[PDB]
Amino acid sequence: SAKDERAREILRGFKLNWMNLRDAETGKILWQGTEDLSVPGVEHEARVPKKILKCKAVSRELNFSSTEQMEKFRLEQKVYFKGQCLEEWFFEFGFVIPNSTNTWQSLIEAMMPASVLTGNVIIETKFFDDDLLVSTSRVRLFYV
Ligand SMILES: O=S(=O)(NCc1ccccc1)c1ccc(S(=O)(=O)N(Cc2ccc(Cl)cc2)C2CCCC2)cc1
């Protein structure tokens, strides 16, 4: 379909350049990386400090480039524990200029112990342009 081809073109043109997470109350960095955790088809891994689970809110900054124009770039993220969805989050960026690089700041508002969670949490992220699914990716989390 034209839509399927279009999703593939958007994916081809997309890269997540860097990302970080902060305690929203203190602004201290909890995590930073330059690995593109959005790449589909491989299980990514990340290690986060266990204090993140006690945060009332986390601020995320995600820097991305896109060759393609998007009308309504958005994300759906599911938190899976042993295969069970515990939480679903929605984030909207909106319009994306073709051949742009953009920083996207979002707030994530709030648990089992870190020792139970560690290695058993998968974040499933779906990237959309409006209702067109561009890609699905997965990251397994370890709490350190
Ligand atoms: O572990 S958490 O502190 N809380 C999730 C949770 C766990 C158990 C029960 C409920 C909620 C957490 C999980 C995921 C995120 S996240 O911002 O979606 N994020 C995953 C992520 C972010 C962006 C993209 Cl494109 C793909 C995946 C990670 C955290 C490690 C590297 C960046 C931020 C915090």
Q: What is the DSSP string of 16-55?
A: EEEEEEEETTT--EEEEE-S-TT-TTSEEEEEE-GGGGG-
The Cα 66–Cα 78 span in angstroms is 23
What are the angstrom distances between the C-alpha of 21 and each of 10, 32, 113, 118, 125? 25, 6, 20, 18, 16
Domains, the chain, with CATH or none: 1-144 (2.70.50.40)
The Cα 54–Cα 24 span in angstroms is 12
Q: Whose CA is nearest to atom 4 of ligand 1?
A: 53
Tokens 């648990």 correspond to 111
The Cα 136–Cα 5 span in angstroms is 16
Widest CA span in the chain: 48
Torsion sign across C-alpha atoms 68, 135, 40, 55 = positive
Check residue 21 and give left, alpha or beta (phi > 0: left; psi -120 to 50: alpha): beta
Beta-bridge mates of residue 96:
70
Q: Burial code of 28-58, b = ≥16 C-beta within 10 A, e = fewer? A: eebbeeeeebbeeeeebebebbeebeebeeb
Resolution (A): 1.6
DSSP secondary structure code for residue 75 in this structure: E
Q: Which residues line ligand 1 (CB under 6 A)?
A: 16, 19, 21, 31, 37-38, 46, 48, 52-53, 58, 60, 62, 77, 79, 86-87, 108, 111, 117, 121, 123, 125, 139, 141
Check residue 12 and give left, alpha or beta (phi > 0: left; psi -120 to 50: alpha): alpha
Q: What are the φ and ψ backbone dihedral angles of 140, each rounded to 5 degrees?
A: -95, 135
Tokens 């994306």 correspond to 96
Torsion sign across C-alpha atoms 125, 136, 139, 78 = positive
**Ligand 1 atom at minimal distance to the Cα of residue 89:** 18
Instruction: Report yes or no: 135 and 38 within 8 Å, Cβ to Cβ.
Output: yes
Instruction: Report yes or no: 122 and 46 within 8 Å, Cβ to Cβ.
Output: no
Q: Whose CA is nearest to atom 7 of ligand 1?
A: 79
Tokens 């970080």 correspond to 20
